[PDB]
Ligand binder design. Sequence first.
Ligand code: JOB
Ligand code: ZN
Length: 109
Amino acid sequence: APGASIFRCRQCGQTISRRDWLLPMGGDHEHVVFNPAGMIFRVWCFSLAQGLRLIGAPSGEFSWFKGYDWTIALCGQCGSHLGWHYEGGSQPQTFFGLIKDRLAEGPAD
Ligand SMILES: Nc1ccc2c(c1)C(=O)N([C@H]1CC(=O)NC1=O)C2=O
Ligand SMILES: [Zn+2]
């Protein structure tokens, strides 16, 4: 009965990802970053995620991950901004960077 298994949206409980899907980008699954508006994010990288809605077309502007374009990822249920989907890069071509404090971690369904 593991308690550290599944990540859900902190606001509504939508299933989003899994600890098993953590991805060590540049040797670390955690990346502490800031946006042009100065907001600091503790971003956890995941190979896969579900339950999101990706908004708009990709952009390379200000990307925290060299060679990747990003799209905003909202919770598909409640619209909470959960992070970004990254695409267009290499090894891997795509991944998710999700905001750790916006997810709740718990046991598997
Ligand atoms: N007009 C904007 C408003 C908010 C944000 C961005 C542009 C942007 O690019 N980012 C992140 C996404 C990224 O990969 N690097 C960042 O600084 C944001 O949070
Ligand atoms: Zn939600």
